[PDB]
Design a protein around this nucleic acid. Structure first.
Lengths: 121, 244, 147
RNA sequence: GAUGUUAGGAGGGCAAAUCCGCCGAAUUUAAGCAUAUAAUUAAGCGGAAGAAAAGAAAAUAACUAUGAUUCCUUUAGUAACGGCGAGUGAACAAGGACCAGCUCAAACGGUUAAUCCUUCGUUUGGUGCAAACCUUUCGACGGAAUUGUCGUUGAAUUAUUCCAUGAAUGCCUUUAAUUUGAGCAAAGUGAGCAGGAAUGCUUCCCCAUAGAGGGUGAAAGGCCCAUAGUUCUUUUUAAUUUAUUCAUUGGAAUUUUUCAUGUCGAGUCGUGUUCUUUGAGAUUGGAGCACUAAUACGUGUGAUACAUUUCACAUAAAGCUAAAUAUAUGUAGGAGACCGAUAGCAAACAAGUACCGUGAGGGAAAGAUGAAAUAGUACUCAGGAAUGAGCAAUUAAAUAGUACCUGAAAUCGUUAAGAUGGAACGGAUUAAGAGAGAAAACAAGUAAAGAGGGGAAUAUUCUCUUCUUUAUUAAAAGAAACAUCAGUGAUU
RNA sequence: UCUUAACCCACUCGUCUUGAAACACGGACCAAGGAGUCUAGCAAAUGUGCAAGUGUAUAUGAUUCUUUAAACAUUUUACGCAUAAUUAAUGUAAUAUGUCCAUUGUAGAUUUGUGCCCCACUUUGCAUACAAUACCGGUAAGCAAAUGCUUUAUUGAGUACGAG
RNA sequence: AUACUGACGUGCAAAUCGUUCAUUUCAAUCACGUUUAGGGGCGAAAGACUAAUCGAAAAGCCUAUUAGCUGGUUAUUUUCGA
RNA sequence: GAAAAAAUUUUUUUUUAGAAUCUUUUUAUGAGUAGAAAAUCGUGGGGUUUGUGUUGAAGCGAAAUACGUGAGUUUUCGUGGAACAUCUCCCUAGUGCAGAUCUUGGUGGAAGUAGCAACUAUUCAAAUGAGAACUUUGAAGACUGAAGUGGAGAAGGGUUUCUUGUCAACUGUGAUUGAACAAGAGUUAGCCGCUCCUAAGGGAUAGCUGAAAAGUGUUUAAAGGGGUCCCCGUCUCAAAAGGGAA
RNA sequence: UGCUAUCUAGCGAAACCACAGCCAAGGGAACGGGCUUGGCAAAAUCAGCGGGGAAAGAAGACCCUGUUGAGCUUUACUCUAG
RNA sequence: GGCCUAUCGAUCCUUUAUAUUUGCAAAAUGACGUAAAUUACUUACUACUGUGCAUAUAGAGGUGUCUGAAAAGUUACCACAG
RNA sequence: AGCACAGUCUUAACGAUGGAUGUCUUGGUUCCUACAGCGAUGAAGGCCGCAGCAAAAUGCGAUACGCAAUGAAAAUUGCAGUGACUGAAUCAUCAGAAUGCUGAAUGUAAACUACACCAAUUCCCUGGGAAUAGUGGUACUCCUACAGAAA
């Protein structure tokens, strides 16, 4: 913006969003952190891991809480346990949720994640 | 691109075939074979006159003319009726020539800036600006023309030590340094009578500029002030006048 | 520009203001100045009388700066004074204005027009006309030759 | 001068936008055409660089002169050239950008070349993890070379001042710039309403040296990444910061005083000639050919052939050199009052591809479901099988069903209505049918009881107002008809 | 509104063409694309700014550095065109006071006056037209010891208190 | 490939088919390999042939060559008008 | 600067102009190609202004007691599912189609028509399969008639072969067929070819010309082979039908 | 006599097409399918045919015009290899 | 100039007349002319000054397709624009 | 259960047909800024390969859609394998690897996987033991150095 090196064109920014490397995709699988935890760490946002616990804030399933099943980094969908959906034949899969539609409560904290939390503090 | 609409190898197939006299591509088994080639009528044929780079990028307009426009636009900005006429909401401003203390040129925050405009009474203008943030129509938007947003206050300043940081990130509000003063910002869209907010320093410096004070013989090579003899008394007074 | 041009006036009118009989052709007289003498002679004679044939010597390597001379007429010399200086001379017949015309870039002083008679002026210049010198002497002034 | 698969090395080739060399046309223009023009261009064959080329006076001036090159502004469409027709066409000054100088050769130095190089070696430093780079003087053994390497820019001689030099001990501190990757990085996922799902609508909040941008099931400063702001780490190069003693050798610049007056690029200049070329003109540059020079008091210049002589200015025939400048190419960025899928690069795509040509070559058509197919058409019935249908079934939506957005016109199907004697449709004018509509094309007010809004009075008393409803009095508006006028006719 | 009716009228459009309904030519139908432009240099017109000047050229400067690829400024007296012309060309280049003054006519806008207005006389006389003289450069002729002159001829994109 | 100017003449075919006729041991025919390339080749000569292409091939470029000549040349009202 | 009407003097209702390219008023006038002008209208973008958006925009189809002389504008109903306008003013343009034997794409009428006309002839019964004139089997009848619709091979093609499936398209009629489509499999050399040799030939060396590119080819040679320091002596590719080891 | 045509089942084009399609006479660009006055004029079709459509092809190769060409020739002008 | 109405030719180019008028680009070419001066690189004063070339003005040499191209034939082999 | 001449023309409704319009858009485009040569240390170009299931682009080269190293760093799935409480699985960086056959192409060649000649060669182990006909070298011109030959 005030920097005149980095582009503000729509076209390039979109292209970067779509052709993103896996690490870049992982970066934009971030979610807002739950309100007391947010206060505790003074941390707005964290990248989700597969075993985390979210509350859904948008879509028809808003106000459902639950553990995260699977992440699809590539096409930008997380899967949550209580947003099941049956297919056309009646077979059950999970509804995909955009990561900005959910707020994160319980983070699973590994050594690396702890080091990141330490960096944020 | 210069050669565009003519790069392909093609010629008129000529008389004896009833087809048009225009050039056709004389290809093989593919659909280009005998297909219309060059010129504005044909598919892929390019413009009738492709654009050369030069289309009068540098025009003049005199030093005296430019100077006149700035002076006259500042004079117009002075006028209360013109400020309202330009579409600025202005009923609760105390009077249109707004000169403030130099404390403005020391401000820190966006909040202080908003409070300052509200204190002046320019709240209604700020509301109009805040509302006027919208996504543009038409096929230009995607050529990096996302918004249309309107124009409110222009702050005319001596020192950059508050206004620069304070009124930055404020929708529809512009700042300009008193020496610098651009006509395009003083009269947007060619519309005279923008709401101009002056520091006492800026206002006073303006008088010095057109006062012939300091800087030896330099200013306009010993010159000041557009000052033609076109004049009023208003017309109705002249006719009403008892002798007349 | 495009708003106001001739196509917008003539847009649906087929022969385009260029004549249904005539039918506007690529170069209907040939190029540029070609028809001179041959068939456009009457135009050249009535509008361009000095044009054809040679006159005079050839200088082959002239150079403009050798013959460069800006001139001034005597009439306008008192005008090279500012207003207060002109008033001061008008008042005082004891002293003459000296005028160095070189600072004003002039080199020859020519003789045109009237003067407010009986007032001396010193003119310093490279060149003077016969009449200019005579008028400056006549009004009680002086001419000074100076390179 | 041969020879060597001798030892160490090099050149070759590709790419080309800008750059440089040769070689080198015509269409065209003159309304024809032959000179001129196109054009010292296009094609052709060659060579380079991140820029090159040009460059340190055989220059311009005639002034009170300037003083390597390039480039811009300019002179200047001028001097000038031209079937003097068409047309073509410079230089000097000036304002600037920018400025940088120089060295071979010859001359000079013979105490025995003060030179150069290969091979073999050898060590005082310093980084880096390691690879490795980086400094560093000393010896050999070979060669080269006096058919000339090195030094030196007249020569000594005086006084001054500077510069290289080596050792010991001290000491490498603070900042500023500059430029990489890094990080950290503000407030709401609050009501209420309708919704397939808000980021919508409202309404109550806020944050902003972040209200650029993108994504987020519909328009988000406060949903996320980003963004503004900063905190560091990276590149180099400036200021600051400390020197103190002991040591040889050598050199330079001035300055005196003597003495020396040397030098200065040849089949080259020049002239004749030819052709080319130009602004060059009784030949401007180039090149071919013939003849072929002079020594600094020479000879090159001073845009008209010449003789005789000035005067001013220069020092050819050897070489190098940064910068401003150019950059339709390659790559990397940033862009846009550009195009928006028949446009725009030939190419938004599995396009320089398919396909075509013996081959040189020529060269396309070709984007869009949905929010989500980790929602992609389940199941049943009738079907040989395609398929169809469903009381069945996904989705907000399937006449959204994957050759899926919207889905125009040509064209054609069903139904309905009308028509129809060798065209068809139209204009002008009424008709009868078939459809649509009440806003001018009627109904102000009053009483009864439902819904709202206000104002005053001191959240609620008084009171003013507009819509629905029942019935209950007006009226106005247009069209008729006759009478009455004024204007205009015709009649007897 | 649409729809037939019936009465009256109604010849293929475009086209080049003296003359097209033509036995003149193009057109099976529909969709989309599809043609007086841009630059250079010149001219008049009009607008606009300044004026005997005008145009900041190239370029420098900045607390100009999302916009800003323009906008702003011109050093704590370059160049274009216009300011007098003429001409092969060296050259030459005043309408003159010897109250800033002082070119001559005739029409002619405007102004003064008279006898709550038109007037008829007078009064002043722009612009412009139609002339007139000068004078400057060329060219003559006449003279001629050049500050070369001269009554008198002619000629110029001339000049007669600047207009660009 | 002489004739039937046969069939065909929106073909089976950018020269076919039928019938007729000429040629057959030599200046014979056929293949494969080879040579000569565009104002050039090659020609028992017809301006023949040179890849369905020839009184100057094909390819690409100069090139958007040029044209007193042909065709086309797009909304409305109003005005003056050859 | 006050006119009328409704009520029952006093209440109510209608109207009540000042935009100097504007408004009131009068009189005259109205042909039109080539051609010139003015006033408008519409399209893309930009600045400017103040609006329209998912209780549905643009777009589109059908229309509208609609407005304007007209270009057109506006609206209703239906579709549609995302962005849309600016007449307040003004810059900007690749800006307005019936036509070019226009360009490109789609599509009709012609028309169930032209047509599916070389090469003597097929029949009967069965099998297969949902379905058989043109698949398969059998029985008849026939033809090609060894210059063969037969064997082998070259060029050229390139898995077309072959087995197993198989029927969306194609197989100009049908079709279960197939040189079509899908899956697999298949080509084995001391002795058969190439491979070796030279020819007609091609490319180079040595040279020499040519700015180079190239043109040439022993033509001013100090270059490859055999013997035991001598003797020969340009090289190389070129026949799948010449020569040639089995 | 064969093969087609013809009719059926199946398959299935194209050229072409302003709009089309009854005549007589007149006038008119001096030869009209449409114009004007007359004759007249009744569905839908199936098979033939070449009167007419001044039928189709394709910017008449004829002829003429161009300060467009090209091939060829000379004691046309001007060059030029040899 | 010819009794009148008829008896003729641009620019560039060539050529010769003419001038007390000019140029050939830093200078000069009659002439040390005329005076003085001479310890000399002296100082004044002079209307009429080398070859060659260039001008300016005035005629003449020519353009009869006569407001002024240095210009023959041919194509039934032909191409193209109309 | 009856009633409708058919055709042609026209009209409206509702569709087929077709892909226009509108709306989009990881694309073009031009300008400006910036750096800017690769090659016998074998390039570009071209072939031939290479995926567990793998055709075409992309990617890569017999170690072949990843190796090593680094920084991120827990997943990866069409099937199937694999890995995680950080040198594996995933990405990006990529400085160490490797580097097919060719191609200037250079041993002679060329519608050849043809053909010479000279070196035989490679690995393991600490100065010894095993393997393989495999692997190299051998163009033309030039230069500097050396050599024994000649006049």
């Amino acid at each position: 913006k005030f920097n005149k090196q980095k582009s503000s064109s729509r076209r390039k920014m979109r292209k970067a969003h779509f052709t993103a490397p896996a690490g870049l995709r992982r970066k934009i699988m971030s979610s807002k952190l739950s309100k007391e935890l947010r206060l505790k760490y003074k941390t707005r946002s964290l990248p989700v891991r597969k075993d985390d616990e979210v509350l859904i804030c948008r879509g028809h399933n808003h106000g459902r809480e639950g553990k995260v099943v699977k992440i699809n980094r590539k096409r930008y969908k997380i899967y949550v346990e209580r947003v099941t959906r049956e297919k056309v034949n009646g077979e059950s899969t999970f509804i995909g949720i955009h990561p900005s539609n959910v707020v994160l409560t319980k983070l699973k904290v590994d050594k690396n994640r702890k080091k990141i939390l330490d960096r944020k503090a | 691109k210069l050669g565009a609409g003519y790069e392909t190898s093609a010629e008129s197939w000529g008389t004896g075939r009833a087809v048009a006299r225009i050039p056709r591509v004389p290809g093989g088994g593919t659909h280009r074979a005998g297909q219309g080639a060059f010129g504005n009528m044909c598919r892929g044929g390019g413009m009738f006159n492709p654009t050369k780079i030069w289309r009068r990028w540098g025009r003049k307009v005199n030093l005296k003319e430019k100077r006149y426009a700035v002076c006259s636009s500042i004079a117009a900005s002075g006028v209360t009726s013109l400020v309202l006429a330009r579409g600025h909401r202005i009923s609760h401003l105390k009077e249109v020539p707004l000169v403030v203390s130099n404390d403005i040129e020391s401000l820190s925050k966006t909040k202080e800036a908003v409070n300052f405009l509200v204190s002046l009474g320019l709240k209604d203008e700020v509301n109009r600006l805040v509302k006027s943030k919208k996504i543009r129509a038409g096929k230009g938007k995607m050529r990096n023309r996302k918004y249309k947003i309107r124009n409110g206050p222009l702050i005319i300043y001596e020192n950059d030590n508050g206004v620069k940081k304070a009124f930055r990130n404020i929708p529809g509000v512009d700042l300009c340094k008193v020496t610098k003063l651009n006509l395009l910002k003083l009269a947007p869209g060619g519309s005279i009578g923008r709401l101009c907010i002056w520091s006492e320093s800026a206002f006073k410096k303006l008088d010095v500029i057109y006062g012939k004070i300091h800087e030896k013989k330099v200013t306009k090579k010993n010159y000041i002030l557009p000052k033609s003899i076109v004049h009023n008394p208003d017309i109705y007074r002249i006719i009403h006048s008892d002798k007349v | 520009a495009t708003r106001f041009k001739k196509n917008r006036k003539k847009r649906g009118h087929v022969s385009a203001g260029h004549g249904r009989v005539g039918k506007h052709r690529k170069h209907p007289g040939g190029r540029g100045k070609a028809g001179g003498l041959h068939h456009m002679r009457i135009n050249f004679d009535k509008y361009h009388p000095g044009y054809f044939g040679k006159v005079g010597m050839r200088h082959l390597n002239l150079l403009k700066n050798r013959t460069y001379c800006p001139t001034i007429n005597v009439d306008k010399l008192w005008g090279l004074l500012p207003e207060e200086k002109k008033k001061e001379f008008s008042e005082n017949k004891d002293i003459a204005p000296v005028i160095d015309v070189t600072r004003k870039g002039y080199f020859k002083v020519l003789g045109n027009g009237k003067l407010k008679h009986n007032q001396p002026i010193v003119v310093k210049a490279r060149y003077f006309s016969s009449v200019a010198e005579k008028k400056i002497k006549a009004v009680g002034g002086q001419c000074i030759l100076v390179a």
